[PDB]
Structure formats: C-alpha cells, structure tokens
C-alpha cells in the first residue's frame, strides 16, 4: 500500500515465532522499539497491528517515535511511546518500473500534523489561501499528494522500499501472540524435575494404567498429592512417585 494508505491488520491468538522472520531476507532496516529484537520471539502482546506500505530510499528514517519530517508529519505518524517496531527492506525488483511507478504517493502538503496511526486517503486539490483552483491550475494550487515515480535508473536513495510496521501492546496484555515454547524431550524412570505446563515437581515417572477422562489434565490421591499427569504432546498418562528417601 502507499505510505498514507497502509493496510492495517491484527495478528493475535497465536503461538508467535518472531524468528521465522530472519530466514526471509537480509532485513535492511530492522530495529525494534520498546522491546528488544533478540527478546521478541518470547515476549507476549495484546494486539499486534501491521501496516504495510512503500516509501523512497532516503525517507525511511522518518518512521520513528516522535520524528518529524514530510512523510511522518503529513501522512503517517507513530507515537513516541510506540511499542512494536518497523521493518524496511529495499524492493525495487517488484516496485520500480521504467518511466515512473505512479502508484505510491505521499502527502507533501497538508494543514497540520497527524496523530499516531492516523491514515488518510483524501486526494482533493489543496487550497490556495483564497478559493483554490478547484479542478484547474494557476498561481499556487498545489496538490497535497505527490507520486514517487520509481524507475530502475534511480539511485538507491530514490528506490522503492517495502516497509512493515508492527504495533504491539504491553499494557494489560491478554497474551495471544507470542511464546515459542520448548518441550524438553521426555525422560522416564528417573527421579527428574518436571514442569508440565506450569505444574512443577520431582519424582519418578512410570507408565500409567488409569483412564483419564478426555477433559482431565491432573491426577490426585487423597490430600491433593499430585499423582499423575497427561502429556501435552502425546497425551499419554504418567504416574508420579517421589524418588526414594529414608533414614539410615
């Protein structure tokens, strides 16, 4: 989409691996705000919004928290307390044509600045102080939007760049998009420290002979002693007995 017409989307309710990205491309522009890129794949978020668009080469710097410019102050603005991050990778093999790709535009003239995540599409002819040259030309009737017009003879500063902006939320988050997990391969017949989806304990694991009902996840003897657990991977029932101890 264009800079001023990004295609908003939400990405929630999923076990999100933020490291599947790294196998895609060289990731020319990859810096994360509010969250470290290294510690991204694990952290959890409320709602992850995605804005996709294309800009020129020397204007990718204006997409930053609190940064003023001509694409940031006129047609796309992200907060200063922004949590998420922006990812821009030069793409002039699918976006720059010979003669000028007049498909990506950018608000060059406007009235004031825009609020964070404020997208506008209006393509009216800008005023001229007085009544403008509505549908005509003249002294100063300058359209607010201007096309980039990418071509394969432009320098890297004038080449199209695809860019995705991810907006996270960390305040009150109903963890819905995050967590890669790590099911440490199972060990049996040795008293081992176990953590089954939060249930932590120690003991010897043995093949079970009791029929857990399909909606049950735990087993208990008298006095709430956790006696058994079902595998979250293979759904097999296992018996827990505390490893041997005694007096000498």
């Amino acid at each position, epitope marked *: 989409a264009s800079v001023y017409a990004w295609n908003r989307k939400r990405i929630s309710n999923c076990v999100a691996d933020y490291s599947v990205l790294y196998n895609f491309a060289p990731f020319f522009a990859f810096k994360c705000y509010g969250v470290s890129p290294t510690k991204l794949n694990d952290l959890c978020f409320t709602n992850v919004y995605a804005d996709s668009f294309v800009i020129r080469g*020397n204007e990718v710097s204006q997409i930053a928290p609190g940064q*003023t*410019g*001509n694409i940031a*102050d*006129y047609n796309y603005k992200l907060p200063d307390d922004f949590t998420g991050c922006v990812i821009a990778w030069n793409s002039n093999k699918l976006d720059s044509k010979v003669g000028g790709n007049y498909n990506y535009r950018y608000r*060059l*003239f*406007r*009235k*004031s*600045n825009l609020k964070p995540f404020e997208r506008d599409i209006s393509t009216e002819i800008y005023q001229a*102080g007085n009544k403008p040259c509505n549908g005509v030309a003249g*002294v*100063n009737c*300058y*359209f607010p939007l*201007q096309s980039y017009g990418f071509r394969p*003879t*432009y*320098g890297v*500063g*004038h080449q199209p760049y695809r860019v995705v902006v991810l907006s996270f939320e960390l305040l009150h988050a109903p963890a819905t998009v995050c967590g890669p997990k790590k099911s440490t391969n199972l060990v049996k017949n040795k008293c081992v420290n176990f953590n089954f989806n939060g249930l932590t304990g120690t003991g010897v694991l043995t093949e079970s002979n009791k029929k857990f009902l399909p909606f049950q996840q735990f087993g208990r003897d008298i006095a709430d002693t956790t006696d058994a657990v079902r595998d979250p991977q293979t759904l097999e029932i296992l018996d827990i007995t505390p490893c041997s101890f005694g007096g000498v």
Partner: antibody
Amino acid sequence: EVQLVESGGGLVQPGGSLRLSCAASEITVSRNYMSWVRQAPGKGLEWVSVMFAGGSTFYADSVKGRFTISRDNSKNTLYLQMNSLRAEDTAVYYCARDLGVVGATDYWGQGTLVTVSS
Amino acid sequence: EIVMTQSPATLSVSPGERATLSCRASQSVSSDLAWYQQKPGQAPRLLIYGASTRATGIPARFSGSGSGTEFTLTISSLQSEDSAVYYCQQYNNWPPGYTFGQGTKLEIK
C-alpha cells in the same frame, strides 16, 4: 503584486545579532515552503534555511546553531534572526518560496545587504 | 552536498545567434533541475524547471536539456538585454535541500 519584501539589512558589530524579515502579498507563507537564500558579494548563492507548513524547519550547516527563522503567521510575513555574524556571513539575503519537484523556486525577494564592521 | 560545475565561464556571441551552456553534476540528478537568470541588480528569475519545462512567461527562446549527471541550457537568439548570470539549481533531496552553481556570465559583442 505577488512579491516578497525584506527588512533588517544593515550593519552590526561582530558577535552581535540581527533579524531579517520577509513580507509577502497575494500569497501566504505559513503554509508555503519558505526558503531564505543569500549571496556573498561576487559569489554564488546558497540555501540557508527552510520552514515547512507544519513548522518543522531546517538550516544549512554553515549557519547551523546561530540563525533562527520565524514567521508572524497572524499577519502573513516571514522572519530570519541572525546572531554571531562572522567575517563570512557578510552577504545579501533573499527570501524565496520554493516548491521543488512541482515547480522550482520562483518568487524571490528584493534582498537585504548584511555586512560587518570590517 | 553534490557539487555542480558550470562551463564555460564566459561566452561572447554576436547578436541574434544561439548560445550553449553546460553545467555538470557529479552524481545522478535525473531530471531534477532548474535554470535562473539573475539580471544584474536584483533577485534571480526562474526560466526552466524540472528537466526542460519552461517556467511560465519565460520566452520560448530558452531551451534546457539533459538528465542524469550532465545538463545543458540553450538560447535560440540572444537579444541585447539577454546579458545576465545563469545558475542550474538541483533538488534531488528537496526537504531540506538545493544546490546552486558558480554562475555564468553571458554577454553580447
């Protein structure tokens, strides 16, 4: 007629301050990319500063940190404050409304001489 | 900061003929240019913007051409009052940017 008229030109002792002013007519400045240009006697021209229509301004490197552009939008006029005038900054300053890719700089100002004691 | 170099410095042509002035860039300036005629004594005047588009009013007698790293301005028939200075201003980076030349002095007889 459409014009840019300037004021503030004169003489001041080094290290002193100054203020250049730019008046317009039949055209607004607040919402117009404004650009002050200057010319040293006998030399070329150089882009000095620019203010946008949202307020985010910019300045050249040679004068960064010493000059400050402003405009009384209420009465449709432009200004450029200068300080710490050194031997180089002696030049004639022009006011311009630059558009860029959609029509290059056109409308200019009568200019204003800025010299130093010596 | 792309440095532009004009050439030649001076030109003296009999009245009524053509004149050809080159201004040379050091990088890709594609079609982002303009030509100003600053008659001696006041502010410059825009003649030809973009690549070769003739500014309003500006007599057709002027003609601009070129693209990339090399550009040229051409005048059909110099009249006695055409003597002035000309500068090619590039703007490949518009917010904030422009780059002027050293100017060229053209006269007649």
